[PDB]
């Protein structure tokens, strides 16, 4: 079976709830494994305590920069960057989990959860899963974003890990 992982998210230090994600290890095992291990923190680093630093209403919520907390940082379990595994899964609608990057073959740890269909990102960002539960939490995060991506509340992944 595919891993299920969770992110427990605060806004301004108060809990919003839990986002549960299915990682499509069947389609993108290398990309799924990176995210899974960053959720557990088993390599000695990962998402716990880090933020959603860029959130744009009617677009997506972006997180995963656990080194610089601003979009410039992050790293993978393999090294600083790893290749685009494939573009088999598409940005079909709200709830899609996909890798942020800095162009082709620059995946690190940054990711985004879509709040709309983002078809223009097909073939540019590796989709590797989707929201199983907690779209309400995602919509809350979204509501704290802005046109510029600046958040109006501090959005923190307080706890994360693997459910199965």
Curated annotation (Swiss-Prot):
The modification S-nitrosocysteine is found at residue 160. The modification N6-succinyllysine is found at residues 24, 43, 132, 147. GO terms for biological process: apoptotic mitochondrial changes; cellular response to arsenic-containing substance; cellular response to calcium ion; cellular response to hydrogen peroxide; mitochondrial depolarization; mitochondrial outer membrane permeabilization involved in programmed cell death; necroptotic process; negative regulation of apoptotic process. GO terms for cellular component: cytoplasm; membrane; mitochondrial matrix; mitochondrial permeability transition pore complex; mitochondrion. Its EC number is 5.2.1.8. It catalyses: [protein]-peptidylproline (omega=180) = [protein]-peptidylproline (omega=0). Residues 6-162 form the PPIase cyclophilin-type domain. GO terms for molecular function: cyclosporin A binding; peptidyl-prolyl cis-trans isomerase activity. Keywords: Acetylation, Apoptosis, Isomerase, Mitochondrion, Necrosis, Rotamase, S-nitrosylation, Transit peptide. It comes from the Eukaryota. Coiled coil: none annotated. The modification N6-acetyllysine is found at residues 24, 124. Belongs to the cyclophilin-type PPIase family. Associates with the mitochondrial membrane ATP synthase F(1)F(0) ATP synthase; the association is increased by inorganic phosphate (Pi) and decreased by cyclosporin A (CsA). Interacts with ATP5F1B; ATP5PD and ATP5PO. Interacts with SLC25A3; the interaction is impaired by CsA. Interacts with BCL2; the interaction is impaired by CsA. Interacts with TP53; the association implicates preferentially tetrameric TP53, is induced by oxidative stress and is impaired by CsA. Interacts with C1QBP. Interacts with MCUR1. This is Peptidyl-prolyl cis-trans isomerase F, mitochondrial. It comes from Homo sapiens (Human).
